[PDB]
Design an enzyme around this catalytic site. Structure first.
Site, PDB file in Angstrom:
ATOM      1  N   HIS A 110       8.621  39.029 -15.731  1.00  0.00           N
ATOM      2  CA  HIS A 110      10.030  38.938 -15.369  1.00  0.00           C
ATOM      3  C   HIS A 110      10.943  39.191 -16.560  1.00  0.00           C
ATOM      4  N   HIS A 111      10.419  39.091 -17.781  1.00  0.00           N
ATOM      5  CA  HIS A 111      11.163  39.422 -18.985  1.00  0.00           C
ATOM      6  C   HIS A 111      11.095  40.906 -19.319  1.00  0.00           C
TER       7      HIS A 111
ATOM      8  N   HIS B 190      19.050  29.790 -35.938  1.00  0.00           N
ATOM      9  CA  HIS B 190      19.376  28.773 -34.944  1.00  0.00           C
ATOM     10  C   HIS B 190      18.315  28.730 -33.854  1.00  0.00           C
TER      11      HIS B 190
ATOM     12  N   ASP C  16      -6.271   3.151 -30.521  1.00  0.00           N
ATOM     13  CA  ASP C  16      -5.870   4.220 -31.424  1.00  0.00           C
ATOM     14  C   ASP C  16      -6.332   5.549 -30.845  1.00  0.00           C
TER      15      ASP C  16
ATOM     16  N   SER D  53      -0.672  24.300 -36.020  1.00  0.00           N
ATOM     17  CA  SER D  53      -0.542  22.854 -36.171  1.00  0.00           C
ATOM     18  C   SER D  53      -0.331  22.175 -34.825  1.00  0.00           C
ATOM     19  N   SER D  54       0.515  22.755 -33.971  1.00  0.00           N
ATOM     20  CA  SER D  54       0.735  22.184 -32.648  1.00  0.00           C
ATOM     21  C   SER D  54      -0.543  22.212 -31.820  1.00  0.00           C
TER      22      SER D  54
ATOM     23  N   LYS E 166      10.115  18.132  -5.970  1.00  0.00           N
ATOM     24  CA  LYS E 166      10.252  17.064  -6.960  1.00  0.00           C
ATOM     25  C   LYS E 166      11.666  16.490  -6.963  1.00  0.00           C
TER      26      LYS E 166
ATOM     27  N   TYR F 273       8.236  25.718 -19.795  1.00  0.00           N
ATOM     28  CA  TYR F 273       7.690  24.720 -18.875  1.00  0.00           C
ATOM     29  C   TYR F 273       6.939  23.621 -19.618  1.00  0.00           C
TER      30      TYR F 273
ATOM     31  N   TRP G 177      15.119  35.552 -32.258  1.00  0.00           N
ATOM     32  CA  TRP G 177      14.046  34.645 -31.864  1.00  0.00           C
ATOM     33  C   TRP G 177      12.810  35.423 -31.423  1.00  0.00           C
TER      34      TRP G 177
ATOM     35  N   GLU H 276       5.984  28.521 -22.194  1.00  0.00           N
ATOM     36  CA  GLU H 276       6.400  27.628 -23.274  1.00  0.00           C
ATOM     37  C   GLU H 276       7.530  26.710 -22.832  1.00  0.00           C
TER      38      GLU H 276
ATOM     39  N   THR I   1       9.409  22.509  -7.502  1.00  0.00           N
ATOM     40  CA  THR I   1      10.487  21.855  -8.236  1.00  0.00           C
ATOM     41  C   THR I   1      11.526  21.276  -7.282  1.00  0.00           C
TER      42      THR I   1
ATOM     43  N   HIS J  14       6.949  32.659 -21.398  1.00  0.00           N
ATOM     44  CA  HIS J  14       7.265  32.123 -20.077  1.00  0.00           C
ATOM     45  C   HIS J  14       6.746  30.701 -19.876  1.00  0.00           C
TER      46      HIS J  14
ATOM     47  N   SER K 252      10.738  10.626 -14.432  1.00  0.00           N
ATOM     48  CA  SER K 252       9.968   9.913 -13.420  1.00  0.00           C
ATOM     49  C   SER K 252       9.576   8.513 -13.872  1.00  0.00           C
TER      50      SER K 252
ATOM     51  N   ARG L  30      24.838  40.247 -24.613  1.00  0.00           N
ATOM     52  CA  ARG L  30      24.655  39.162 -25.563  1.00  0.00           C
ATOM     53  C   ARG L  30      24.303  39.715 -26.939  1.00  0.00           C
TER      54      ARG L  30
HETATM   55  C1  HEA Z   1      13.883  25.728 -20.306  1.00  0.00           C
HETATM   56  C2  HEA Z   1      13.069  25.861 -19.266  1.00  0.00           C
HETATM   57  C3  HEA Z   1      13.201  26.891 -18.221  1.00  0.00           C
HETATM   58  C4  HEA Z   1      13.055  26.698 -16.902  1.00  0.00           C
HETATM   59  C5  HEA Z   1      12.732  25.429 -16.168  1.00  0.00           C
HETATM   60  C6  HEA Z   1      13.275  27.978 -16.288  1.00  0.00           C
HETATM   61  C7  HEA Z   1      13.213  28.175 -14.968  1.00  0.00           C
HETATM   62  C8  HEA Z   1      13.156  29.399 -14.382  1.00  0.00           C
HETATM   63  N1  HEA Z   1      13.430  30.603 -15.011  1.00  0.00           N
HETATM   64 FE1  HEA Z   1      13.936  30.934 -16.879  1.00  0.00          FE
HETATM   65  N2  HEA Z   1      14.190  31.206 -18.760  1.00  0.00           N
HETATM   66  C9  HEA Z   1      14.066  30.309 -19.788  1.00  0.00           C
HETATM   67  C10 HEA Z   1      13.746  28.974 -19.590  1.00  0.00           C
HETATM   68  C11 HEA Z   1      13.511  28.320 -18.395  1.00  0.00           C
HETATM   69  N3  HEA Z   1      13.552  28.970 -17.213  1.00  0.00           N
HETATM   70  C12 HEA Z   1      14.332  30.952 -21.107  1.00  0.00           C
HETATM   71  C13 HEA Z   1      14.332  30.353 -22.537  1.00  0.00           C
HETATM   72  C14 HEA Z   1      14.602  32.255 -20.804  1.00  0.00           C
HETATM   73  C15 HEA Z   1      14.957  33.414 -21.745  1.00  0.00           C
HETATM   74  C16 HEA Z   1      13.805  33.958 -22.496  1.00  0.00           C
HETATM   75  C17 HEA Z   1      14.231  34.617 -23.750  1.00  0.00           C
HETATM   76  O1  HEA Z   1      14.872  35.683 -23.634  1.00  0.00           O
HETATM   77  O2  HEA Z   1      13.779  34.161 -24.826  1.00  0.00           O
HETATM   78  C18 HEA Z   1      14.502  32.395 -19.384  1.00  0.00           C
HETATM   79  C19 HEA Z   1      14.714  33.594 -18.749  1.00  0.00           C
HETATM   80  C20 HEA Z   1      14.376  33.877 -17.467  1.00  0.00           C
HETATM   81  C21 HEA Z   1      14.343  35.209 -16.892  1.00  0.00           C
HETATM   82  C22 HEA Z   1      14.678  36.492 -17.691  1.00  0.00           C
HETATM   83  C23 HEA Z   1      15.948  37.256 -17.286  1.00  0.00           C
HETATM   84  C24 HEA Z   1      16.302  38.374 -18.263  1.00  0.00           C
HETATM   85  O3  HEA Z   1      16.481  38.106 -19.465  1.00  0.00           O
HETATM   86  O4  HEA Z   1      16.256  39.544 -17.846  1.00  0.00           O
HETATM   87  C25 HEA Z   1      13.956  35.044 -15.578  1.00  0.00           C
HETATM   88  C26 HEA Z   1      13.799  36.057 -14.672  1.00  0.00           C
HETATM   89  O5  HEA Z   1      13.060  35.925 -13.731  1.00  0.00           O
HETATM   90  C27 HEA Z   1      13.766  33.597 -15.380  1.00  0.00           C
HETATM   91  C28 HEA Z   1      13.383  32.924 -14.205  1.00  0.00           C
HETATM   92  C29 HEA Z   1      13.227  31.539 -14.031  1.00  0.00           C
HETATM   93  C30 HEA Z   1      12.844  30.930 -12.769  1.00  0.00           C
HETATM   94  C31 HEA Z   1      12.558  31.629 -11.490  1.00  0.00           C
HETATM   95  C32 HEA Z   1      12.794  29.581 -12.964  1.00  0.00           C
HETATM   96  C33 HEA Z   1      12.429  28.546 -11.926  1.00  0.00           C
HETATM   97  O6  HEA Z   1      11.578  27.555 -12.520  1.00  0.00           O
HETATM   98  C34 HEA Z   1      13.606  27.749 -11.385  1.00  0.00           C
HETATM   99  C35 HEA Z   1      13.249  26.955 -10.144  1.00  0.00           C
HETATM  100  C36 HEA Z   1      14.239  25.842  -9.921  1.00  0.00           C
HETATM  101  C37 HEA Z   1      15.083  25.822  -8.880  1.00  0.00           C
HETATM  102  C38 HEA Z   1      15.343  27.102  -8.146  1.00  0.00           C
HETATM  103  C39 HEA Z   1      15.923  24.657  -8.508  1.00  0.00           C
HETATM  104  C40 HEA Z   1      15.229  23.611  -7.618  1.00  0.00           C
HETATM  105  C41 HEA Z   1      14.753  24.163  -6.298  1.00  0.00           C
HETATM  106  C42 HEA Z   1      15.278  23.843  -5.099  1.00  0.00           C
HETATM  107  C43 HEA Z   1      16.549  23.046  -4.811  1.00  0.00           C
HETATM  108  C44 HEA Z   1      14.619  24.433  -3.914  1.00  0.00           C
HETATM  109  C45 HEA Z   1      15.549  25.203  -3.014  1.00  0.00           C
HETATM  110  C46 HEA Z   1      16.120  26.458  -3.659  1.00  0.00           C
HETATM  111  C47 HEA Z   1      16.396  27.620  -3.011  1.00  0.00           C
HETATM  112  C48 HEA Z   1      15.755  28.007  -1.710  1.00  0.00           C
HETATM  113  C49 HEA Z   1      17.579  28.443  -3.399  1.00  0.00           C
HETATM  114  N4  HEA Z   1      14.029  32.892 -16.550  1.00  0.00           N
HETATM  115  C1  HEA Z   2      15.797  24.529 -27.888  1.00  0.00           C
HETATM  116  C2  HEA Z   2      16.660  25.212 -27.141  1.00  0.00           C
HETATM  117  C3  HEA Z   2      18.063  25.468 -27.515  1.00  0.00           C
HETATM  118  C4  HEA Z   2      19.043  24.570 -27.715  1.00  0.00           C
HETATM  119  C5  HEA Z   2      18.966  23.074 -27.603  1.00  0.00           C
HETATM  120  C6  HEA Z   2      20.220  25.336 -28.063  1.00  0.00           C
HETATM  121  C7  HEA Z   2      21.420  24.804 -28.353  1.00  0.00           C
HETATM  122  C8  HEA Z   2      22.581  25.515 -28.378  1.00  0.00           C
HETATM  123  N1  HEA Z   2      22.676  26.894 -28.424  1.00  0.00           N
HETATM  124 FE1  HEA Z   2      21.236  28.224 -28.480  1.00  0.00          FE
HETATM  125  N2  HEA Z   2      19.800  29.480 -28.317  1.00  0.00           N
HETATM  126  C9  HEA Z   2      18.497  29.258 -27.960  1.00  0.00           C
HETATM  127  C10 HEA Z   2      18.005  27.997 -27.657  1.00  0.00           C
HETATM  128  C11 HEA Z   2      18.662  26.787 -27.744  1.00  0.00           C
HETATM  129  N3  HEA Z   2      19.965  26.698 -28.074  1.00  0.00           N
HETATM  130  C12 HEA Z   2      17.711  30.523 -27.954  1.00  0.00           C
HETATM  131  C13 HEA Z   2      16.219  30.776 -27.626  1.00  0.00           C
HETATM  132  C14 HEA Z   2      18.612  31.487 -28.305  1.00  0.00           C
HETATM  133  C15 HEA Z   2      18.395  32.996 -28.468  1.00  0.00           C
HETATM  134  C16 HEA Z   2      18.074  33.380 -29.861  1.00  0.00           C
HETATM  135  C17 HEA Z   2      18.062  34.848 -30.053  1.00  0.00           C
HETATM  136  O1  HEA Z   2      18.900  35.496 -29.392  1.00  0.00           O
HETATM  137  O2  HEA Z   2      17.427  35.295 -31.034  1.00  0.00           O
HETATM  138  C18 HEA Z   2      19.873  30.841 -28.517  1.00  0.00           C
HETATM  139  C19 HEA Z   2      21.007  31.528 -28.885  1.00  0.00           C
HETATM  140  C20 HEA Z   2      22.278  31.058 -28.793  1.00  0.00           C
HETATM  141  C21 HEA Z   2      23.484  31.867 -28.855  1.00  0.00           C
HETATM  142  C22 HEA Z   2      23.437  33.410 -29.026  1.00  0.00           C
HETATM  143  C23 HEA Z   2      24.566  34.121 -29.790  1.00  0.00           C
HETATM  144  C24 HEA Z   2      25.065  35.375 -29.075  1.00  0.00           C
HETATM  145  O3  HEA Z   2      24.355  35.899 -28.197  1.00  0.00           O
HETATM  146  O4  HEA Z   2      26.259  35.682 -29.222  1.00  0.00           O
HETATM  147  C25 HEA Z   2      24.538  30.978 -28.720  1.00  0.00           C
HETATM  148  C26 HEA Z   2      25.871  31.279 -28.719  1.00  0.00           C
HETATM  149  O5  HEA Z   2      26.597  30.756 -27.917  1.00  0.00           O
HETATM  150  C27 HEA Z   2      23.939  29.642 -28.582  1.00  0.00           C
HETATM  151  C28 HEA Z   2      24.605  28.413 -28.432  1.00  0.00           C
HETATM  152  C29 HEA Z   2      24.024  27.133 -28.404  1.00  0.00           C
HETATM  153  C30 HEA Z   2      24.798  25.906 -28.363  1.00  0.00           C
HETATM  154  C31 HEA Z   2      26.285  25.828 -28.341  1.00  0.00           C
HETATM  155  C32 HEA Z   2      23.903  24.866 -28.335  1.00  0.00           C
HETATM  156  C33 HEA Z   2      24.172  23.377 -28.314  1.00  0.00           C
HETATM  157  O6  HEA Z   2      25.213  23.078 -29.260  1.00  0.00           O
HETATM  158  C34 HEA Z   2      24.644  22.753 -27.012  1.00  0.00           C
HETATM  159  C35 HEA Z   2      24.886  21.260 -27.163  1.00  0.00           C
HETATM  160  C36 HEA Z   2      23.777  20.602 -27.950  1.00  0.00           C
HETATM  161  C37 HEA Z   2      23.986  19.875 -29.061  1.00  0.00           C
HETATM  162  C38 HEA Z   2      25.331  19.944 -29.715  1.00  0.00           C
HETATM  163  C39 HEA Z   2      22.931  19.134 -29.803  1.00  0.00           C
HETATM  164  C40 HEA Z   2      22.754  17.653 -29.412  1.00  0.00           C
HETATM  165  C41 HEA Z   2      21.791  16.881 -30.280  1.00  0.00           C
HETATM  166  C42 HEA Z   2      21.759  15.535 -30.380  1.00  0.00           C
HETATM  167  C43 HEA Z   2      22.771  14.538 -29.818  1.00  0.00           C
HETATM  168  C44 HEA Z   2      20.847  14.977 -31.402  1.00  0.00           C
HETATM  169  C45 HEA Z   2      19.638  14.266 -30.853  1.00  0.00           C
HETATM  170  C46 HEA Z   2      18.583  13.968 -31.912  1.00  0.00           C
HETATM  171  C47 HEA Z   2      17.466  13.209 -31.747  1.00  0.00           C
HETATM  172  C48 HEA Z   2      17.567  11.798 -31.274  1.00  0.00           C
HETATM  173  C49 HEA Z   2      16.157  13.548 -32.397  1.00  0.00           C
HETATM  174  N4  HEA Z   2      22.553  29.705 -28.625  1.00  0.00           N
END
Ligand code: HEA
Ligand code: HEA
Ligand code: PEF
Ligand code: PEF
Ligand code: PEF
Ligand code: CUA
Ligand code: CA
Ligand code: MG
Lengths: 238, 69, 45, 54, 57, 537, 75, 88
Positions: F295-296, F67, F97, F162-163, F324, F250, F132, F248, F321, F246, F261, F444
């Site tokens: 941070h991870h 998944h 093109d 490819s990407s 924005k 963004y 993952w 990816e 952010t 990290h 926008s 988890r």
């Molecule tokens: C999908 C995109 C996305 C985005 C945008 C972000 C945004 C951020 N993420 Fe996250 N993050 C993930 C995707 C993302 N992350 C994923 C996939 C993981 C798990 C990785 C994995 O295990 O595979 C992860 C995990 C993850 C961790 C790991 C925790 C753990 O597993 O131990 C941490 C820790 O620092 C973190 C931090 C942040 C921070 C600081 C931001 C910041 O960008 C957020 C900033 C945004 C705001 C805060 C809101 C707007 C701001 C304002 C309104 C200003 C005023 C606010 C204050 C003064 C309060 N992220």
């Molecule tokens: C791309 C990012 C992404 C997205 C979209 C999702 C989608 C979802 N994920 Fe997943 N998930 C991850 C990224 C993502 N996940 C990652 C990185 C992990 C960790 C893997 C690891 O641990 O190894 C994870 C793991 C993970 C777990 C971990 C299991 C465990 O720890 O017990 C669970 C369980 O709740 C979960 C739930 C869901 C659910 C309910 C949705 C969704 O169902 C929520 C609602 C969304 C939809 C139902 C789909 C809607 C789609 C459309 C309407 C079609 C549009 C099509 C086009 C027009 C092209 N995800």
């Protein structure tokens, strides 16, 4: 200490770092609830009243920030500093080391946990070691908690601080306990040094977090505090 | 001086990085002043100068490294 | 060649009575693949 | 990363114990290869400039 | 000796795609396509053998 | 004989328009499989204990890993990053093109074999089990014996290359094929964002290529790259992986920023507030999102000074952010709003979910705070409530906003709005209780859990079911739009102002748009931009 | 009978990662016993310095490697 | 027009080409031959072999790891396997 049903808060625990972590979490939540409700209300109100049927004229000629962008830069950054400082002094308090007393070892290979207390090696030449195992569901004591008990439960005295040693000899594990708020990675080859201090005399629960194969969810960890006389009796028992 | 040489050969990496940066900058300043010399060609000439200087200082350093009394 | 698009780029002809079953069957099989996937790992068990 | 902080089974030295004396000396055939490559680059630049000269 | 102009003018007279403009290119692709099809047919059985735990003996 | 014409128009065709549609279709067929996988895994944890299965933990690991991998690398990246860019970027830059048509054709077709080989790998006797983020010792031949995870490694490798190959032509196209009089500063925000993602992805992914190859070589060549007894340190693997992971997310979410926008002004009939400040803050985000990677690795056990250095800088990401979001809030007010439009609905719903997800992300950016939430359900809630609320919503909004330009059809507004509401409610009640489940201190990736957690899992399961009906309704509405023959004008999103006569507007006002793509007919010509559009120099 | 005494605050390394400490104590104890004598008091405290914090399970493999002489240390 | 500029460019290119020919046949050759002579001396100095050592702390416990069989041959041979410099 133990999970409840329909819980909303974290839990009631006992550890010097755990109270500080909860305090910091309370302050940080107080910070963010403000901004969350403010942005939600702004989004709701800027649209619920400014629909097309009520506002057919758009003031399209305002696309310059005179004094607003500066305040946008400052005020949330001020909040950022205000939240960063307490966490920074908490961390700079935690990174120090107190006066060492004794150590424990938490080596665990796969689906079971082994503990060692080799501080008390003496003429007896009988270092104490054992293995904590997942209790089967069928053999659970009447009224026991499923998935959260072990047979050879770990024993640490209360009010005594221990410099726990974390080590592993297999795929990486983790050593977690939410009540004590202490965690580190059971990384093979390298030993992780962590501390601990129990205030009460009670049974604490926890388990690993980093997945280690099929049975990652089969090594619960239970540590309970004991008084000095009970601790001594336990030590002389083996 | 019997002491300057000790620090000159004690830290070979920092001084060698510094002289590489100095050669790079000087060659860029000198070469990037002509007309019939595009930027890639002048950069290539500067890098060739850097390679030659690096080779000669490498031979000099490995020659002087025998003094480990 | 100067053709005018008919605003139809569907990759395959579509119409009411017949193609609906084909589209729905393709959707169903691509939805139900995970099923056979989960069944395969528990075949000999 | 593998060099600056060696593990504690490596003898506290990045060159392995017993294999450190089996390493590659700075002055051997690879140095000759490096000088050959430098002269090759010089000759290639000469050829390119002559080609520019038609 | 410089036949590039003559052959250029000879080859610009055809409307074929650039991957078939030069004569004799077609004979190097049809057996190539057949070999690719055979490779796909063999790889189907190879993958089927890989997924199903077994080895021929 | 149209069969030759059929396959020349589809397979032996290198036009940008004929490829993005296949990008969308491939994304859809990956996303359905991923959604069913997510449904089955969420139905497993409905109640404590083995359920619908014979306690097969390895099967659950395979399900979660599949998944995650397929929905992060086969659903969102290929169907958002390059799908809406290759079709649309030439339109806004002023070129007929892309720079290299052949590489554009090649990049798409590397993905189908990747999907087939990933399915074959998952169909092995064991299957991938590292999740993952696969880890060397678990992936070591000691645990897995067979061609299960090697093919997953290969799929990740080839998809990444490819990407990278699908992003080299885009940068050249939008750096050299610019319109006469179109300064790079005056570029639209969407293409700005897409170029930033392209450069970031190309800069970072090679590192993954090298690290993944060297880690995979441990299984075959028996290298000591990461062996604990061989002198290898897996913390090096974690550092290598999280120097990529990290940024990816963004680079995945920036196209959502651009599409939001773009959606806001046209459906608001108001120019975007502070374009230069927004783009410079986004550039600051792009540069900033590289020096923070550890941070991870907060609870691995690194030094105090390194932890402080890489935890203090985690907070500064929030400021641009927030700027924005404030700019978008300011843009929304004052100008007219058509809240009933589906793209407007998705754009409005994106903001609140993204900001609450950002607040959750700033919750756990501290080493003092992460210890209570590291590798628990709270991080799951954070990253899901950011990913599936931002990237998925942006993709849905982009589809519903540019679909007439892709094909030239009209969808059903009622069914689309119903689908949006159902999906929003389902995804809000799916990731809601998980916040409490992770706040209690429960980890988890566990098919079984202690008994005092059943209620929130039960609350999540119903929403997981609801999401499937949302998917069904989206499928029905897509089919209906494809076979409804509902015509569309040149610029369907242009309306007369408050003082435009009904006869003056129709004859002396048509053919005007804020962007180029709305100037051409909705089914765009094969050869557009015969002459270059020249602006005021 | 028993007292609370173990490795103190190691000033050589105050950080969390202290894996090299076990090997350092092992080699230092071996060098200490090679010189001086055998029954001398001071390095009996060094003996405790690589058993209280070390797993003592790697010690068996260390003995196996060192008995045949392949142990890669100066002493 | 074009004649003067093309003449100047060709003249500069020809002068640079002559200078580079002098470079490649004046200094590069002596350096190459000197390096070749030194390399030959180093290669001929150490023609004593004796590359068969054992029982002096053998193995070191991280040599010739065998977790997956090597594809070439039986499984204990490498592509550049040598009977004099590669031992066990
Ligand atoms: C999908 C995109 C996305 C985005 C945008 C972000 C945004 C951020 N993420 Fe996250 N993050 C993930 C995707 C993302 N992350 C994923 C996939 C993981 C798990 C990785 C994995 O295990 O595979 C992860 C995990 C993850 C961790 C790991 C925790 C753990 O597993 O131990 C941490 C820790 O620092 C973190 C931090 C942040 C921070 C600081 C931001 C910041 O960008 C957020 C900033 C945004 C705001 C805060 C809101 C707007 C701001 C304002 C309104 C200003 C005023 C606010 C204050 C003064 C309060 N992220
Ligand atoms: C791309 C990012 C992404 C997205 C979209 C999702 C989608 C979802 N994920 Fe997943 N998930 C991850 C990224 C993502 N996940 C990652 C990185 C992990 C960790 C893997 C690891 O641990 O190894 C994870 C793991 C993970 C777990 C971990 C299991 C465990 O720890 O017990 C669970 C369980 O709740 C979960 C739930 C869901 C659910 C309910 C949705 C969704 O169902 C929520 C609602 C969304 C939809 C139902 C789909 C809607 C789609 C459309 C309407 C079609 C549009 C099509 C086009 C027009 C092209 N995800
Ligand atoms: C990710 C890191 C891996 C290394 C990176 C290289 C990837 C493979 C090489 C692809 C070419 C890169 C761009 C060259 C510049 C360019 O654009 O060449 C120009 C053309 C496209 O442009 P055009 O003719 O339309 O221009 C218009 C001219 N006026 O390219 C190509 O036809 C590429 C040739 C096809 C090769 C694709 C197959 C790739 C095999 C990958 C496996 C081998 C590597 C395995 C690694 C373990
Ligand atoms: C964390 C939260 C803390 C908040 C702290 C911030 C406090 C300061 C912010 C207020 C500054 C802007 C007010 C305008 C003053 C003014 O009068 O500006 C002058 C202009 C008047 O128009 P003109 O330029 O054409 O005049 C021409 C003169 N000849 O106004 C505007 O154009 C307003 C247009 C954009 C502003 C929209 C605001 C949208 C929401 C903003 C943030 C909401 C916060 C939500 C959370 C609380
Ligand atoms: C398709 C691309 C494949 C090549 C990629 C090259 C990438 C360069 C960086 C990687 C390091 C390579 C070093 C190994 C060279 C070597 O020969 O390894 C050394 C060993 C033997 O040497 P020795 O022990 O005798 O040395 C000591 C001398 N006394 O030979 C091998 O194991 C042969 C296999 C190595 C791989 C090279 C050929 C690849 C064919 C299979 C393709 C695999 C595709 C994987 C999935 C895409
Ligand atoms: Cu033990 Cu995960
Ligand atoms: Ca279950
Ligand atoms: Mg972890």
């Amino acid at each position: 200490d133990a999970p409840s049903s329909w819980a909303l808060y974290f839990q009631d625990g006992a550890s010097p770092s755990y109270l500080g972590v909860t305090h910091l979490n309370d302050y940080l939540m107080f910070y963010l609830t403000f901004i969350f409700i403010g942005v939600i209300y702004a989004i709701c109100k800027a649209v619920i009243e400014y629909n097309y049927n009520s506002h057919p004229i758009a003031a399209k000629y305002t696309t310059h920030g005179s004094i607003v962008e500066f305040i946008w830069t400052l005020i949330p950054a001020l909040i950022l500093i205000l939240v960063a400082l307490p966490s920074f002094k908490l961390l700079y308090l935690l990174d120090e080391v107190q006066k060492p007393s004794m150590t424990v070892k938490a080596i665990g290979r796969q689906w079971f946990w082994t503990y060692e207390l080799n501080d008390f090696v003496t003429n007896e030449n009988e270092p104490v070691s054992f293995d904590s195992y997942m209790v089967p569901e069928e053999d659970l004591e009447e009224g026991s908690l499923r998935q959260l008990e072990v047979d050879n439960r770990l024993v640490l005295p209360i009010d005594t601080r221990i410099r726990l040693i974390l080590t592993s000899g297999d795929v990486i594990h983790s050593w977690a306990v939410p009540s004590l708020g202490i965690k580190c990675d059971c990384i093979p080859g390298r030993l992780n040094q962590v501390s601990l201090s129990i205030d009460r005399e009670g049974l604490f629960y926890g388990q690993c977090s980093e997945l280690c194969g099929v049975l990652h969810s089969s090594m619960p960890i239970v540590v309970q505090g004991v008084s000095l006389e009970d601790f001594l009796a336990w030590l002389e028992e083996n | 001086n019997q002491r300057a040489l000790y620090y000159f050969n004690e830290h070979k990496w920092p001084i060698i990085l510094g002289t590489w940066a100095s050669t790079m900058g000087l060659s860029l300043y000198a070469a990037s002043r002509n007309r019939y010399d595009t930027a890639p060609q002048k950069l290539i000439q500067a890098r060739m100068y850097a390679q030659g200087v690096t080779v000669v200082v490498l031979l000099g350093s490995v020659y002087l490294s025998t003094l480990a009394n | 060649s100067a053709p005018k698009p008919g605003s139809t780029i569907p990759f395959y002809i579509n119409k009411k009575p017949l193609p609906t079953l084909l589209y729905f069957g393709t959707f169903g099989v691509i939805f139900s693949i995970p099923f056979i996937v989960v069944k395969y790992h528990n075949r000999n068990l | 990363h593998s060099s600056l902080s060696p593990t504690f089974e490596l003898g506290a030295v990045w060159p392995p114990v017993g294999i450190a004396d089996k390493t590659i000396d700075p002055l051997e055939v690879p140095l000759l290869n490096t000088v050959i490559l430098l002269t090759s680059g010089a000759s290639l630049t000469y050829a390119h400039y002559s080609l520019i000269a038609r | 000796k410089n036949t590039i102009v003559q052959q250029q003018r000879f080859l610009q007279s055809i409307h074929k795609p650039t991957y078939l403009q030069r004569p004799g290119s077609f004979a190097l692709v049809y057996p190539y396509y057949a070999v690719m099809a055979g490779l796909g047919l063999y790889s189907l059985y190879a993958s089927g053998r890989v997924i199903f735990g077994k080895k021929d003996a | 004989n149209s069969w030759w014409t059929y396959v020349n128009r589809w397979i032996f065709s290198t036009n940008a328009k004929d490829i993005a549609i296949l990008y969308l279709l491939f994304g859809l067929v990956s996303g359905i499989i991923g959604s069913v996988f997510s449904f089955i895994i969420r139905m497993e944890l409905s109640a404590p204990g083995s359920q619908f299965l014979s306690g097969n933990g390895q099967l659950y690991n395979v399900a979660i890993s599949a998944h995650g991998i397929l929905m992060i690398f086969f659903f969102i990246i290929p169907a958002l990053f390059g799908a809406f860019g290759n079709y649309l970027v030439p339109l806004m830059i002023g070129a007929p093109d892309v720079a290299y048509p052949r590489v554009n054709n090649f990049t798409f077709w590397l993905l189908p074999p990747a999907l087939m080989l990933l399915l074959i790998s998952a169909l092995t006797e064991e299957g991938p089990g590292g999740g993952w983020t696969v880890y060397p010792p678990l992936s070591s031949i000691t645990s897995h014996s067979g061609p299960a995870i090697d093919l997953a490694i290969l799929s990740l490798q080839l998809t990444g290359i490819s990407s990278t190959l699908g992003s080299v032509n885009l940068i050249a196209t939008m750096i050299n094929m610019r319109a006469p009089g179109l300064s790079l500063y005056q570029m639209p925000l969407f293409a700005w964002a897409i170029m930033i993602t392209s450069i970031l992805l190309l800069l970072t992914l090679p590192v993954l290529a090298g690290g993944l190859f060297m880690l995979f070589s441990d299984r075959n060549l028996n290298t000591s790259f990461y062996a604990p007894e061989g002198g290898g340190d897996p913390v090096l693997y974690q550092h290598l992986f999280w120097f990529f992971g990290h940024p990816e997310v963004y680079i995945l979410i920036m196209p959502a920023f651009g599409v939001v926008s773009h959606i806001i002004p046209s459906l608001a009939h108001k120019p975007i507030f502070g374009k230069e400040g927004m783009l410079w803050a986004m550039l600051s985000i792009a540069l900033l999102g590289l020096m923070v990677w550890s941070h991870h690795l907060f609870t691995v056990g690194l030094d105090v000074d390194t932890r402080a250095y890489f935890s203090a800088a985690t907070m500064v990401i929030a400021i641009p952010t927030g700027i924005k979001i404030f700019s978008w809030l300011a843009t929304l007010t004052g100008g007219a709003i058509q809240w009933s439009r589906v793209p407007m609905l998705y754009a409005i719903g994106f903001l609140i979910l993204f900001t609450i997800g950002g607040l959750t992300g700033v919750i756990l950016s501290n080493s003092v705070l992460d210890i209570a939430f590291h590798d628990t359900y709270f991080v799951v809630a954070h990253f899901h409530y950011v990913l599936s609320m931002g990237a998925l919503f942006g993709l849905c909004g982009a589809y519903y906003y540019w679909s007439p330009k892709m094909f030239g059809l009209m969808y059903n507004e009622t069914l689309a709005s119903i689908q949006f509401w159902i999906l929003f409610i389902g995804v809000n009640i799916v990731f809601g209780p998980q916040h409490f489940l992770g706040l209690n201190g429960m980890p988890r990736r566990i098919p079984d859990y202690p008994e005092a957690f059943v209620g929130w899992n039960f609350v999540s399961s119903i929403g997981s079911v609801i999401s499937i009906l949302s998917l069904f309704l989206f499928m029905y509405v897509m089919y209906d739009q494809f076979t409804s023959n509902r015509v569309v004008k040149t610029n369907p999103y242009l309306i007369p102002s408050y003082f435009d006569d009904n006869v003056i507007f129709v004859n002396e006002k048509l053919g005007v748009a804020q962007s180029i793509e709305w100037l051409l007919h909705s089914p765009v010509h094969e050869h557009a931009f015969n002459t270059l559009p020249t602006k005021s120099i | 009978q028993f007292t609370f005494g173990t490795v103190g605050f190691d000033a050589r390394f105050p950080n969390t990662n202290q894996t090299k400490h076990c090997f350092q104590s092992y080699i230092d104890y071996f060098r200490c016993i090679k010189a001086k004598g055998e029954d001398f008091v001071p390095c009996k405290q060094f003996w405790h310095a690589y058993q209280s914090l070390c797993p003592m399970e790697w010690v068996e493999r260390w003995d196996e490697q060192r008995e045949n002489g392949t142990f890669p240390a100066p002493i | 027009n074009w004649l003067e500029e093309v003449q100047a460019e060709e003249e500069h290119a020809k002068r640079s080409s002559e200078f580079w020919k002098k470079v490649t046949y004046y200094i590069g050759g002596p350096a190459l031959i000197l390096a070749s002579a030194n390399a030959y001396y180093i290669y001929c100095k150490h023609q004593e072999h004796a590359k068969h050592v054992e029982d002096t702390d053998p193995g070191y416990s991280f040599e010739n790891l065998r977790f997956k069989k090597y594809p070439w041959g039986d499984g204990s041979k490498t592509l550049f396997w040598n009977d004099k410099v590669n031992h066990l």
